[PDB]
């Protein structure tokens, strides 16, 4: 419950920041650019913190089993229950996902040790080489 409580408070403050940026964008007059940048950066880093904390406590969230209250009446609140207990993406995200699979050529249910595995090994090395090259370039010139 502690992990979900932290999840709750952080998500609540994130929603509060979203409400903030909303009611300062809803004005007919746009404020100064700098205030918009500050709000954007704060809210966006807060979203990063949300993602990181959600990532930290995956096990507590997975262990929890959802069950309706005995006192909660489903006969009158079935619409509210079905609003919360359904969780599919917006279609423009699933069609974006399908277009991304098609554009990249990636598909992840039949892959085996032949050509794609030699390509996978031949990719690791470019990253390491580029990292070392830029470390060398940084070391070449004194930046202090």
């Amino acid at each position: 419950g502690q992990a979900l409580d932290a999840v709750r408070m952080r998500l609540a403050q994130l929603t509060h920041s979203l409400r903030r940026i909303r009611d300062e964008m809803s004005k007919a007059e746009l404020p100064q650019w700098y205030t918009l940048q500050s709000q954007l950066n704060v809210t966006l880093s807060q979203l990063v913190s949300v993602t990181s904390t959600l990532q930290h406590f995956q096990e507590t969230l997975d262990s929890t089993v959802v069950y309706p209250l005995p006192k909660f009446p489903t006969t009158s609140h079935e619409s509210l229950v079905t609003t919360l207990l359904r969780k599919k993406n917006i279609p423009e995200v699933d069609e974006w996902m399908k277009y991304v699979r098609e554009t990249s050529g990636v598909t992840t249910a039949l892959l085996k040790d032949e050509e794609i595995e030699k390509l996978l090994q031949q990719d690791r090395e470019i990253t390491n080489w580029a990292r070392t090259t830029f470390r060398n370039e940084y070391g070449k010139h004194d930046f202090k």
Binding site: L119, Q122, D123, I126, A130, T133, E137, H141
Partner: protein, 115 residues
Amino acid sequence: MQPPYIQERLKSLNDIETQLCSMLQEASQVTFIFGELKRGNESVKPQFENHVKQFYERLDKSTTQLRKEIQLLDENVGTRLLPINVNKKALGQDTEKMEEQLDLLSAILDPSKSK
């Protein structure tokens, strides 16, 4: 026109922002090339080292020369362009507007020069 020193100072500054523009452009090409390098054609791999090296050397010496320009802002106080007092022009407007008027009178006084 402005005295000598200011002209090369503005030329150096203009060179500074042109170098900054070149740095931005080279950042654009290096970002471009890294994309196809990640796509996995190795032909343009040698060009990557050259682009990175030129990008870094363009980033460094530009900032270095802008360091010299701010030293020159501090160091040129009352210096190189030494003071001069030979009548000060805010007053001496009375003197050029004396001289030229009499010149006009001369042109009026001589009827052979009014042609």
